[PDB]
Amino acid sequence: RENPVYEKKPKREVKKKRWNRPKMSLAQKKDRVAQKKASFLRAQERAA
RNA sequence: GGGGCGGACUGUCCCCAGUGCGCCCCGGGCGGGUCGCGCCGUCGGGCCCGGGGGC
Numbered sequence: 001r002e003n004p005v006y007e008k009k010p011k012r013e014v015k016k017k018r019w020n021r022p023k024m025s026l027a028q029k030k031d032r033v034a035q036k037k038a039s040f041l042r043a044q045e046r047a048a
Numbered sequence: 049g050g051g052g053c054g055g056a057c058u059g060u061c062c063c064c065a066g067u068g069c070g071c072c073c074c075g076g077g078c079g080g081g082u083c084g085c086g087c088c089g090u091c092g093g094g095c096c097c098g099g100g101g102g103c
Contacts, residue, residue, distance in 0.1 A: 031067045035059040043060050
C-alpha cells in the first residue's frame with residue numbers, strides 16, 4: 001500500500017546467438033534425398 | 049559462373065564427398081525501368097522557330 005508502482009528491469013543488449021536449429025532449404029533437402037538414393041544404389045550394387 | 053572470410057547442415061565413398069546461408073572481392077552475361085549525350089529519318093509541330101512563280 002505504500003509503494004505499489006512497478007519499475008521495469010533495465011534491458012541488456014543481446015549477443016545474437018541462435019539456440020535452435022534453423023530450417024533447411026529446398027536445395028539442401030533435395031540434395032539429401034539425391035545422395036541418399038546414390039548411397040543406397042552404391043551399397044546395394046556391392047551387397048549383391 | 050569464380051575467389052576469400054565465418055558458420056550451419058546432409059550422405060550405409062565419409063580418413064572423404066556434398067548443399068545452403070551472412071559479408072567482401074568479383075571478370076562478368078541478360079533485359080527492361082530512370083536520366084544524360086551524339087547520329088540518323090519526318091512533303092512532323094512551334095499563325096510553316098529564327099538569320100542571308102503563286103497566295
